[model samples]
Target chain A: ERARGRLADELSLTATVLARELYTVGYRLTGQALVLSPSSQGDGVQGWFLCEAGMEEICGEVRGTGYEVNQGALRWGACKGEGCAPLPNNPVLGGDEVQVEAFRVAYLEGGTWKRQAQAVNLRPEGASPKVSALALYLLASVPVRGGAPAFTPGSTLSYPPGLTSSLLELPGAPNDGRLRAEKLWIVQTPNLAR
Target chain B: ATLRERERARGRLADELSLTATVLARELYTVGYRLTGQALVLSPSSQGDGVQGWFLCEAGMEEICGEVRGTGYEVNQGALRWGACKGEGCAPLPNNPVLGGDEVQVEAFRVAYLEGGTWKRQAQAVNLRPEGASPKVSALALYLLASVPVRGGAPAFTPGSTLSYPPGLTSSLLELPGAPNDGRLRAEKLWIVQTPNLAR
Candidate 1:
């Protein structure tokens, strides 16, 4: 019970801290619990992604991207190391650029949480120097209610509740089939040093 | 005034009235009250289509229509502001430059009104200090004038109330056989005339 209690405390702290950081930077919640990026023209989705921080690379990964009005449509772009990787000429709206917002130290498994031991890289701007934090996964829609399945992390990993049966849509990701991931792990990866 | 002159006068009045609303909104925001929506619209029945400015403050969503002698707004002393200058010719104040460390306080005028045929000008003030001192003040003047009865070439408050009291503002009437411009009432220099519903 104490172990569960500690886990709950950590998750709560991580959620609270990340929520505040997002709000300070003008991310607001839509009616569906999805995040909305601020724009003068109109409200639209802002894409987020996970990347390894502080690693050598051909170019740093994209993190913390926003939408701008481009020729009547929302243009998307995000900063990588030394330069930016803009969306291809194929009509960038919200999902074209990659921006990172947060890094979490744990993962959800069957409605439960477990601390991550490795695969650290996902650090948000002004985030703690600690590595091993993974990208905070966001679902494209409100999470469906479900029953719990007991799990043991060390023996085998259970998939996160939000990962299965739901498309992981990002800012560039859409409710429509244009760009979305079948699962969280299968999402697009940015440039990294070999 | 010529036809062109009349148009220019109306245009200038409209601009001053809008400024009054903006100044009031800014003052209210420093203390967390929002201007949510327009509260009242005052027009004078005496003029064929003469409409005057109305009051704004923290209130519900409905805009109430009422009657006034006229509309006036003034950015006084090139610093302070007031809602209605009424009969005091709604002329623009001297545009003087505001100095640093200047602040906008919700203060009021010792306004003289004819209430029930008796003249009285009471002291009104609201305590509000801006979060930061303003860099400079913009001098403007507008008027939402009230209808007044005349006696012996002097202005007296018109009998009966033709205006509805705004929910967040306190108001009074003046009715005195005495003239409105008696020397006692002349001393009142109206600042931002607001009786805001704030704790004393």
Candidate 2:
């Protein structure tokens, strides 16, 4: 039981860290930040980031990969969606971009928690788990309003100076502005089979 | 008074009245708006200013209506009333104060507005709080209600508009449902706003 508790605790911690990282990606992509609201259907908690024109386009492209890329993200967990059978010890990732919906920020001062479904769209590659994890810090570092794109892929398709470098050191980067990712969370649909 | 001068004074009064009306209506709507952590709609009432206006809550939020009233955030038809309970501590509650933390205390207002031809004092709810407690209202919800342009007869909260809340209020707070225990709200999507007609 103690071992089980420890494992559960560790998993929770991992989820929390990954969730924050995911949020950072969303923040960097859009000028807005993420918020936690009760799920519409009461499944559990859901993290929301207001997707704008650029972010939506990016998420749509990633969802097209379907099971192939999804499986890649969930290699450690079971794969479940349009394809893939249950597999033991299969790592899971959040499922297909659950419909991207629109909601309102409540009117009145301090009234910030209002939302509604606009239209649903598939998740794109930009929002994928692997990309999100790798891109989070890079995205967070870039100066958004007037700065250059945070990451410019080199000929090798890898970010120059590696992913660990501070955002300030990057070439063509600007001094810190409003683009910093203060709070972030990332959730892929859980793998069903695992 | 000359016609032009009279017109200017009326125009100013109308502007002032309209501004006051919006402030009053917004104050009432803000109560329910913050609870669900989503945007709400304040429809212009056909009755004009005689009766309080009617504001619509976001779809998929029928559950929050009772929660708002039960917490002592009262809404009469459409108009929000002044004089809420001060609770065991704090000054007498003002109309549509932002409630924060587990105990549901009103926080200091960061901004104030004019109402009923007088300067109305209000408090800004605590945007961030310590662990294991509710934070101020969600900025996403407030922006949607404040920014969306009302159109047609449907009274919906549209999305993708330029009218959004200030960036500073967008800071993640722990009070949000999915945030980590450290008391910071987390980002999930790049942008999410309410579109009432879409949901209906």
Candidate 3:
């Protein structure tokens, strides 16, 4: 039998640090500029199935040209020396049946920071997806008319399209840049066994 | 050891004045008679309860578990023996006494049990004093030494001859045992301060 001693380690966002982690990131959706800003930082997204919560733990992530050595539920096999592309940069990976009981995602529109929260439309059972390690890859390598992702570390990323047909076309360069994904996880104690 | 005066006070036989002190203590006993011991208890119980050494004896004989009052038995020539039964069947020695008065000239005869071994004497010096006078028992001293067997150790000494307890109720040395099993053995030295002003 597995030695079943349980505990919730670390992972607390202090009021100070939490308030600081929330910077803004912008992306374009259908020609509409989506500027998501923080209404409040460090909001507890409990009720979310975390990496280690469910059966298998999430360890790896891969997306064309970008493959990350991970520990995930899909335990997606490791990539050879240079098979998949460099892994997805900032993705909100909640792969294992994660539920976001409450998450506030605010995007900018006219002027002020307009905050919007996510709610499950299926009455329940609905939540955010792990991430398109795919999108992050394309956004990084895909050239923007003139050049590829000019998103250096300090500089934010500009989400571009053509990564997929229907997806919103991120203006080649960033408004600041949507290429940068500012993500924080809502972890849960694996104590509640279904 | 009861004083020569106290032996005279209660008379010769341990049963001689058993009636006097016994009746007085029994009068205070609600149902049966009473007895007293563990004088240290009157010292306001403290310190890991090490101070107020309390013990309770339920009379399988009498079906009572109450106070054993005033020196339970009478002392005859320094030896003490049994006295009363509280209420009825509580014969074999009463337990909790009405909490007070611990010492008496007749006291030093209080019984205490030591484990595994009993009394054994080594040697004794009759009179090694300058005036040929040995000594007198002022305050009764009690020494407690807790240690495990060590191959090489000095011989244990008799109470007052060569081994002398520094007078008064004082705790000397490094007092308590230390660190898991630090090798140095611990010895606690304690004594009765007869009738202390503070005890009053």
Candidate 4:
């Protein structure tokens, strides 16, 4: 029986979404097989967590209740750094902060390809009703080599009313102008809410 | 007089000026500027990782070192960003109002960050240089003249430009040969870099 390799059926994962307490924001990671974790920062560690569609490893640390996630077989320890303190009690989030999802996830557990029921929220609560275009998210499903996950092109989740972009007709000395306009959108949330 | 004949007497001065201008123009083709190209200069996207992100050095080199050109950054409900390599390092950022993205082709001009406890290059799909876009550096010195009071806050005096590949200085005075009446490069692109109002 092949049950000794970690990358085998033993590649468990976990995450702790970190956020600064007094501060206002959270940490981020790109699509990868390494998985993501939640944390807390600011004055102290009191931030919870949230995630995107395909990221099964993304944990919404719940503090004492913490937004921590431990991949079934992949047991990770207490997430380190600021914003690492567990939550005390559940407060308010959903209403004022609704998680509108736009991407999907497909993960592997027992060497079998499976879809992990996960959805990262995009805060569109304050978006203007006149909003149009949406933003793109790297498809969660990917080809992995051990934990080295590779994101493929054309795997973007284009949510409706994603982001309102401003096209500046700036001058270009080639790269100067070219690099400048590389951002099709601000590629953000608050700014995307229009 | 022919532009060349005039310099024949200036002992190749005109000839030299032309050559310098030529080099500057060629540099544009090779080492161009980042009008808005960005990098994680710690002071950047992700609102900047810790004390490490975007950096832009000034003229000359070690002797004529420059400080932060201009830096600004922030982020929101986004995705995870991993390193292309163990990528996220003290990579330099340009001193303009531009944001940066992944240098897809593996190392040309890019900054990077990594995931926790892993050695992979993945970053939240925040930035990428369109489908095709190529992106330079310039450092200056000449300790000889003593620290000259820098002029031209002159957004009015200077237009879009890069003093790096510097076109050319001419005449008996410190004036630029082809500078138009505005005392500015006829079309020197001020390759503006829009950074945040970082705490000085």
What is the lDDT of every predicted structure here?
0.25, 0.23, 0.21, 0.20
> For model 1 chain A, where is the 10-residue window of minimal lDDT?
A185-194
Q: For residue B119, what is the lDDT in candidate 4?
A: 16
Among these predictions, the greatest TM-score belongs to: 1
Task: Sort every candidate by TM-score, greatest first.
Answer: 1, 2, 4, 3
Q: Write the per-residue lDDT of candidate 3 for residues A1-194, one digit (tens) a residue.
A: 00000000000111111111111000100111111222332111101111211111110221111112122110112121212222333222212211111123222222222233322111122212211111111111111223323343212334332222112122233443122222222211111110
Give interface RMSD (Å), model 1. 26.2
lDDT of 4 by residue, A151-177 (tens): 222322232231211111111122111
Task: Provide TM-scores for the models.
Answer: 0.21, 0.18, 0.14, 0.17
TM-score of 1: 0.21
Native-to-model Cα distance after best TM-score fit, residue A159 in candidate 1, in Å? 54
**lDDT, candidate 2, B33-134, per-residue tens:** 223322222222211111111123332222122222212222233222234321122232325422122111111111222222222122323221222112
Query: lDDT tens digits, residues B1-200, model 1?
Result: 34443333333222222333334333222221221212122122221111122222211111111121113222333233333422212332324311101222111212332222333233321222244211111111112332111122232223222234323223333221122442111111122322121211
For residues A13-120, could you state the per-residue lDDT of candidate 2 as single tens digits? 333333332332233222112222222221111122332322121221111111111221211222212223323232222112111011111111121212222111
Instruction: Give model 3's DockQ, 2 decimals.
Output: 0.00
Q: What is the lDDT of residue A91 in candidate 1?
A: 23
lDDT score for candidate 4 against the true structure: 0.20
